[PDB]
Amino acid sequence: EAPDVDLADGNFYASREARAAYRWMRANQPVFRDRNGLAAASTYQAVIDAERQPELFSNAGGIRPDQPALPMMIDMDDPAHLLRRKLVNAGFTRKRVKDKEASIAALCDTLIDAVCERGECDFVRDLAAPLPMAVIGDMLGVRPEQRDMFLRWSDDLVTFLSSHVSQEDFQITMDAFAAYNDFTRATIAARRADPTDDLVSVLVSSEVDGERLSDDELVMETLLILIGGDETTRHTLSGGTEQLLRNRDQWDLLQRDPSLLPGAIEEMLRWTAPVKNMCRVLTADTEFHGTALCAGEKMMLLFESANFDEAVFCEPEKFDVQRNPNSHLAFGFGTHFCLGNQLARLELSLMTERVLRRLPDLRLVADDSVLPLRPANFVSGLESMPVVFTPSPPLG
Ligand code: HEM
Ligand SMILES: O=S(=O)(Nc1ccc(Cc2ccncc2)cc1)c1ccccc1
Ligand SMILES: [Br-]
Ligand SMILES: [Br-]
Ligand SMILES: [Br-]
Ligand SMILES: [Cl-]
Ligand SMILES: [Cl-]
């Protein structure tokens, strides 16, 4: 019989038996209907086939199961989506992102300097969560001492996306958006008058097909970026490092061969899949990998389930930094493939290389089974990860 699960319930994703449920789905009903009838593509094949059919599986109903579309690229279909993405892409060209390497590395070393003399830290609180916020904060002009404020707003907003909020949490979300809107419109006005080299400046100057981003669009697209910058990467940093520490052979491999880091980052992404699902709305009735779907309903793409699909990944419950190929779907696939993927990979690489070399005997204090995952139906990962190491002096 099927697992009795609610794929819109954040408690499902905080369960370490979610992958057991996914396994049943992939073997018995690849396009699964949960206890409320919500449809979800669980196999790699079904996720890819849906991604490759955007006219049938649309983003224009919004990418959450019971929330409407907002006016940002991830809730748009081509051709409108393509224009918006080309405009925002000015901030994510390969050279611009790669040029951030020194500044990201300096943030990593500052963060490690803050804990390296202690011999213990909470890897989540002290390294994984602050780095992506500092990177995106610096892109958005956030003063270092205001990063925590933006982190709070981002947590509020991603909680809204990750549940069906009460009235008070709805109000908190709207308040956080109002504050973000105010800050960003102040930045836009300043940069339109006096451009710098930050993200709003680059986005204001972006022009495609004679078109430019309006103030309204700049607020919404930078919001999408902020909540990608500071609520996703953190979970791959923590969860991926956790697997290195749980499997000491993997830690040891990376420490003696830094050239294995690119493959290690890809396996951290496969394993952690911080984005647990994106929704698609059906534009027509269709028989999809054995399940009848109805026009107007939403289907989940279960990216973590796809990333553990034995049809594609041999021994998927084995964490193997050398996996080749490793064509995981943590960033999705197709027209909406994560625009920030290069920046996320760069953050992950730079922080992990420094953790390996500066905290070389890093160990978990407690085992995985007592480390909770955040209840959230959208983006999730570890709440806390106490680690110990031999102390060392800061770089400065
Ligand atoms: C490990 C970190 C991240 C993960 C796992 C992740 C995952 C994803 C996924 C699954 C999608 C949708 C793909 C689809 O439906 O096929 C997406 C889209 C997007 N991501 Fe990320 N993301 C991450 C980091 C980032 C960062 C750092 C940024 C910005 C700096 C960012 C910006 C975006 C944008 C703008 C889109 C929308 C693209 C479009 O609709 O065309 N993401 N991301
Ligand atoms: O900005 S949004 O209109 N929509 C939105 C925002 C973030 C994400 C999460 C995400 C982004 C990129 N890579 C991976 C994951 C998805 C969709 C919005 C934000 C907060 C609250 C409601 C809507
Ligand atoms: Br299938
Ligand atoms: Br659209
Ligand atoms: Br920037
Ligand atoms: Cl199509
Ligand atoms: Cl396995």
Residue numbers in the entry: 3 to 398
Manuscript text:
Here, we exploit the relience of Mtb on host-derived cholesterol to develop a novel class of antitubercular compounds that target Mtb CYP125 and CYP142; the enzymes that catalyze the first step of cholesterol metabolism. The first step of cholesterol degradation in MtbC27-oxidation of the cholesterol/enone side chain―is catalyzed by a 48 kDa cytochrome p450 enzyme (P450), CYP125. − Cyp125 (Rv3545c) is encoded in the Mtb intracellular growth (igr) operon, which is widely conserved across actinomycetes and is essential for Mtb survival in macrophages and mice. (A) Mtb cholesterol metabolism: CYP125 and CYP142 catalyze C27-oxidation of cholest-4-en-3-one to yield cholestenoic acid, which is subsequently degraded to androstendione, acetyl CoA, and propionyl CoA. We subsequently employ CYP142 as a structural proxy to guide hit-to-lead optimization of dual CYP125/142 inhibitors that have low nanomolar binding affinity and inhibit CYP125/142 catalytic activity in vitro.
A combination of improvements made to CYP125 expression and crystallization conditions during the synthetic optimization of 1a, in addition to the tight binding affinity of the dual CYP125/142 inhibitors, enabled us to obtain high resolution X-ray crystal structures of compounds 5j and 5m in complex with CYP125 and CYP142 (and compound 5g in complex with CYP125). In all 4 structures, the pyridine-nitrogen of the inhibitor directly coordinated to the P450 heme iron, consistent with their type II optical spectra and the binding mode of 1a–i to CYP142. In contrast, the conformation of the sulfonamide linker in compound 5j directs the phenyl substituent away from binding pocket of 1a -ii and introduced disfavorable interactions with CYP142_Met74. This conformation might account for the weaker binding affinity of compounds that contain a sulfonamide (e.g., 3g, 5k) or amide linker (e.g., 5a–d) relative to their benzylamine analogues (e.g., 5l–p), and is consistent with the comparatively weak affinity of CYP142 to fragments containing a sulfonamide substituent, which was noted in the original SAR screen (e.g., 3g). Binding interactions between CYP142 and 5m or 5j were exclusively hydrophobic (and metal co-ordination), while CYP125 also formed key hydrogen bonding interactions with the amine/sulfonamide linker (5m/5j) and methoxy group (5m) of the ligands via Glu112 and Ser217, respectively. These additional interactions likely contribute to tighter binding affinity and improved inhibition of CYP125 verse CYP142 by 5m and 5j. In all CYP125 co-crystal structures, the pyridine ring of the inhibitor was rotated 90 degrees relative to that observed for the same inhibitor in complex with CYP142, and the orientation of the 1a–i pyridine ring in the original CYP142-1a structure.
